[PDB]
Write a protein that binds this DNA or RNA. Structure first.
Length: 1073
RNA sequence: AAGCC
């Protein structure tokens, strides 16, 4: 409950010249007491009188009522920041070295010197793009420094390391003053022109870095990155994190985890000798020297010290540095520069063509319905993103403009213009609009924003391709329900003294122009083979249309802004934006590795233990008939690099016998590692989410980094949350939501009261609040209702429905209309109306929590019912599993050591149910987990009608509605829905093996009947309760269940009426991946 | 005013 205490200290620290705590209670008499107390406090404040007597008087309210919020009456003028900063601003400011960056605009020049006029200005290259100010971040850092001013021992050292660093940020900022933000949290030209262009983004990156500093090493790293970053805005992250690829190869393997036949992690005490050719050492040295020529000193020395022995025990430092470099900020170049960088492919094209054929052979020969109704599938799938141009659109009686894809398809259909048979050109006549993608350390990449003709023509086919991958192991990213742990396991499996791993980063090749000819031609050749496999008109046309998109793309043109102009240039490289981006890219990368390996063997004889393509990297494990030597590694490597070289591909190809390093993960010393480089106080791009959504995201970001190895002080994260979640009533009246409002599992949840532990209402007041918040979950939108009433809209919904089903509509029809009414949320005007409605409802709710007819059941109510029937008892579980993911915090790591981990994702969509499969065989429709859940619980007769209404034949519908499988599905769908409501696949839980035998002993559940749903919930609730206790206490407990039989029948009814909750916290997990 | 997932 320390969040509430922390908030007051911060408010008291920020404002000095009152605070009015607002309480509430589920009990009527107590609530009046809360009402009386609130009234007295306002009256006393409106008279400059002490509130000390009132607190004593309403001691009961403070003691038993629940704090709902805090009122902030501050009569200053959002200043203080300027005044506060000077005490810390004593060190000498920093001076930008305007000679470190190639492109002139990447150097820290004075804003004016880059944009002499207010019309030439743009924040596009330094916009933090986040809904929180620089001034607030500064305020947060100072507040923390004051609190830990009188600290001692080691805590003091942490403060001292931080105070030093913040001084650099302060001193430099003061020389120009603090950049003031506008309503939309942007930094305009007038504020900007006096100060160094990159001032604000740099301060945000530095503050974020320094507040994540604890050990002396963190301090050394933060200081170097902070100083270097101010001048270097283009190669510092790449230079800092580049030695990692060499390093993984060095460390020896002394016992690691592998994958067994059951596709699960299993410990293997084996030893693998890290074999490294002298050449590799020179390459590593060149990297270290390069870091050195760039001003770096402390960071290069640390790698050098580590290099004497190369102990996986002192490796955490190397990992720490790699995670750290990403926090310098994003590299945001100019669209044109990002764009500008851009006979023996016979084997490579053939493999791509053959791979394309396998993924569709069976679907095509049979005459799969999804291929036949491909157009329909694309329409249902259609998002609400950009189509490219901002068209003028008339709805009902309203003339408005939008770039949205959904809006464009509807308007075009209502005007006979909708024509997916004609795949628009993307050449010089119709240049492709461009989108961008920014990432720290690496260079900016462009994105094709193609017209919806392309998405529809590609959506059915890509989906078939994905399914083929789903059961193909070479495709790491798509195989089964597999998580990264299984991939880590596979590489280790075959590592021995007579095998060498081959990892290669092919990100550069995908964007190469050399690549585009063999790529499109390979898919097209494959498409032709597929066409000669059937005669189906629907299959050929859908298949043909896909062929057309590849041909149009072969020669595309792009609209690259060059100031305030839009130069049209000829783009001959494969950018991404298509539906087939990831699947096609996966096919090409895999095709490429196979091509290289095939060429190399003519020389050396090895065995292909495993081959893989995972995103922008691909790798293989080879086995030789003899023992591997340093000389052998150099020879295999030179030949592989040379093979890549002949194909004119710029790629990083390395060879080791112990580790690998790819964009997603890296395996050093038999242990798995994941870069913790998610930026906190700077975003890639601006979206349409709110401050609350953003606060939840920052917390989520904090949780992922913390798990991965980078920890930002929680008090700082909490401070950020208080600023972001606040709401202004007026100009001097600010309202700050309480801990209870913020953490309770509601539609307004932003973070968990305790990291890695999700709590659910177990008290009446919590329940009262939870019910009240839901009462105002969805708000109305006038603009949205209008269009929901417009002809063009209803016809679009009607047109889709009359094409999908045969018999009758409504459970399906009601759903299609909403799904569409939702896609209007991308349209700002509608989104804006919703936020305004939410704030007013929220302001009133915090003020005096309303009523509610409840009558709605959720996950929390079901849990609350169970709790009282469990008897806890101290138990003990020994640690039996060695650590494979070294960076995990100590409490999370302990759960894994005792119960183990998993290598899969728990089915939380219900796609593995027979009914979902049946719908798939005959319908292009895709019911959600929630829809399936409502449908399975319907009366036998209703289910039969719904299946038929979707095109399912009678013999099949009739057979299922009675069968054993239908009864079984019922349980499976509920299990899937329940797992989904409990976030068993996210955060910390996704790691734990919930079916651990060790975990199972701790649960003692005697059967007093035999009714699946009830047995499953009790066991799950017990596993979660035991694990949460373990996470917080480091010790275990045994749970006994004495749940009545009369009770279970009541509970089972309760279960088939659970409502799903939507919230920033919920959105944040979805947002992560 | 920012495509696949």
């Amino acid at each position: 409950g320390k969040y509430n205490l922390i908030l007051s200290e911060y408010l008291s620290f920020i404002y000095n010249s009152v605070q009015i705590p607002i309480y509430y209670s589920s009990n009527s008499e107590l609530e009046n007491r809360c009402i009386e107390f609130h009234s007295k406090c306002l009256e006393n404040s409106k008279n400059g009188l002490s509130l000390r007597k009132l607190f004593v008087e309403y001691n009961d309210v403070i003691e038993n009522a629940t704090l709902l919020s805090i009122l902030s009456y501050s009569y200053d003028k959002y200043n203080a920041v300027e005044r506060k900063l000077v005490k810390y601003a004593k060190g000498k400011p920093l001076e930008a070295d305007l000679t470190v960056n190639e492109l002139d605009y990447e150097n820290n020049k004075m804003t004016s010197e880059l944009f002499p006029t207010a019309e030439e200005y743009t924040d596009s290259l330094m916009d933090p793009a986040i809904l929180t100010s620089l001034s607030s971040n500064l305020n947060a850092v100072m507040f923390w420094l004051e609190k830990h001013e009188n600290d001692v021992a080691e805590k003091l050292k942490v403060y001292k390391r931080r105070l030093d660093l913040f001084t650099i940020v302060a001193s430099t900022i003061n020389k120009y003053g603090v950049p003031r933000h506008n309503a939309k949290y942007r930094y305009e030209y007038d504020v900007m022109k006096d100060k160094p262009y990159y001032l604000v983004t740099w301060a945000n990156s530095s503050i974020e870095m320094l507040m994540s500093v604890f050990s002396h090493d963190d301090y050394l790293i933060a200081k170097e990155l902070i100083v270097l970053s101010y001048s270097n805005r283009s190669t510092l992250a790449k230079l800092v994190s580049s030695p990692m690829s060499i390093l993984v190869a060095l460390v020896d393997i002394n016992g690691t985890f592998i994958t067994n036949e059951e596709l699960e992690l299993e410990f293997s005490n084996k030893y693998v000798r890290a074999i490294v050719p002298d050449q590799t050492f020179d390459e590593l040295n060149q990297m270290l020297d390069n870091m050195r020529k760039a001003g770096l000193v402390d960071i290069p020395k640390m790698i050098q010290d580590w290099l004497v022995d190369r102990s996986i025990e002192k490796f955490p430092l190397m990992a720490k540095i790699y995670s750290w470099s990403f926090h310098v900020g994003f590299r945001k170049q100019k669209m044109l520069d990002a764009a500008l960088d851009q006979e023996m492919y016979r084997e490579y094209t053939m493999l791509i063509r053959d791979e394309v054929v396998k993924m569709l052979e069976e679907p095509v020969k049979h005459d799969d319905h999804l291929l036949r109704d491909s157009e329909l599938a694309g329409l249902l799938s259609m998002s609400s993103a950009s189509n490219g141009e901002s068209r003028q659109l008339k709805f009902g009686r309203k003339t408005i403009f939008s770039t949205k894809k959904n809006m464009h398809v509807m308007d075009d259909m209502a005007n006979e213009r909708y024509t997916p048979g004609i795949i628009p050109p993307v050449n010089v006549d119709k240049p492709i609009p461009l989108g961008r993608r920014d990432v720290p350390g690496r260079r900016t990449r462009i994105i094709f924003i193609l017209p919806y003709e392309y998405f529809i023509a590609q959506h059915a086919v890509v989906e078939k391709m994905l399914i083929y991958a789903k059961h193909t192991r070479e495709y790491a990213e798509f195989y089964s329900q597999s998580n990264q742990l299984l991939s880590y396991g596979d590489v280790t499996r075959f590592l021995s003294n007579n095998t060498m791993v081959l990892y290669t980063d092919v990100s550069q090749w995908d964007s190469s122009q050399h690549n585009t000819q063999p790529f499109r031609k390979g898919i097209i050749m494959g498409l032709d083979i597929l066409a000669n496999m059937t005669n189906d008109a629907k299959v050929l046309q859908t298949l043909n249309l896909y062929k057309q998109t590849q041909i149009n793309l072969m020669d595309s043109y792009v609209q690259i802004p060059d100031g305030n102009v839009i130069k049209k240039i000829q783009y001959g490289a494969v950018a991404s934006g298509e539906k087939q981006t990831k699947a096609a890219n996966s096919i090409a990368n895999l095709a490429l590795i196979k091509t290289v390996l095939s060429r190399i063997s003519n020389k050396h004889s090895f065995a292909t233990k495993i081959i893989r393509v995972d995103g922008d990297d691909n790798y293989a494990v080879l086995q030789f008939n003899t023992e591997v030597t340093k000389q052998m590694i150099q020879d295999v490597s030179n030949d592989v690099r040379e093979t890549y070289a002949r194909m004119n591909a710029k790629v990083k190809a390395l060879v080791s016998t112990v580790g690998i390093e790819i964009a997603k993960r890296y395996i050093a010393g038999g242990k798995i590692f994941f870069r913790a480089g998610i930026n906190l106080l700077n975003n890639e791009k601006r979206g349409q989410s709110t401050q609350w959504d953003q606060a939840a995201i920052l917390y989520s970001n904090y949780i992922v980094n913390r798990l991965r190895g980078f920890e930002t002080d929680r008090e700082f994260i909490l401070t950020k949350i208080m600023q972001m979640t606040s709401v202004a009533i007026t100009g001097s009246l600010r309202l700050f939501p309480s801990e209870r409002v913020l953490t309770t599992n509601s539609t307004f949840k932003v973070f968990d009261s305790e990291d890695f532990i999700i709590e659910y209402g177990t008290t009446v007041d919590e329940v009262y609040i939870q019910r009240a918040f839901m009462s105002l979950s969805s708000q109305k939108s006038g603009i949205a209702d209008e269009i929901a009433a417009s002809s063009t809209f209803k016809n679009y919904v009607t047109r889709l429905s009359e094409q999908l089903l045969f018999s009758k509509n409504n459970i399906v029809s009601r759903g299609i209309a909403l799904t569409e009414k939702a896609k209007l949320n991308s349209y700002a005007p509608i989104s804006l109306e919703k936020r305004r409605a939410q704030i007013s409802a929220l302001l009133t709710m915090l003020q005096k929590p309303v009523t509610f007819k409840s009558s709605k059941i959720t996950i929390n109510d079901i849990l609350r019912d169970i709790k009282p029937f469990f008897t806890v008892s101290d138990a003990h579980l020994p640690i039996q599993y060695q650590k494979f993911m070294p960076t995990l915090p100590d409490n999370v790591q302990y759960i894994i050591q005792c119960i183990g981990s998993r290598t899969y994702q728990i089915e939380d969509d219900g796609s593995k149910s027979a009914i979902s499969r049946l719908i798939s065989k005959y319908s292009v429709y895709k019911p959600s987990i929630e829809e399936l859940y409502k449908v399975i619980s319907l009366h036998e007769n209703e289910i039969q009608l719904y299946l038929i209404s979707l095109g399912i034949p009678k013999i099949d519908a009739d057979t299922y509605v009675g069968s054993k499988i239908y009864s079984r599905d019922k349980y499976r769908i509920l299990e899937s829905y329940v797992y989904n409501l409990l976030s068993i696949n996210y955060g910390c839980y996704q790691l734990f093996d919930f079916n651990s035998p060790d975990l199972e002993k701790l649960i003692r559940i005697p059967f007093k009947g035999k009714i699946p749903a009830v047995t499953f919930i009790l066991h799950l609730y017990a596993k979660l309760e035991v694990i949460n206790y373990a996470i917080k206490n480091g010790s275990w407990i045994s749970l006994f269940c004495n749940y009545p039989k009369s009770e279970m029948i009541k509970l089972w009814k309760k279960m088939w009426n659970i409502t799903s909750l939507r919230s920033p916290y919920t959105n944040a997990n979805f947002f992560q991946e």
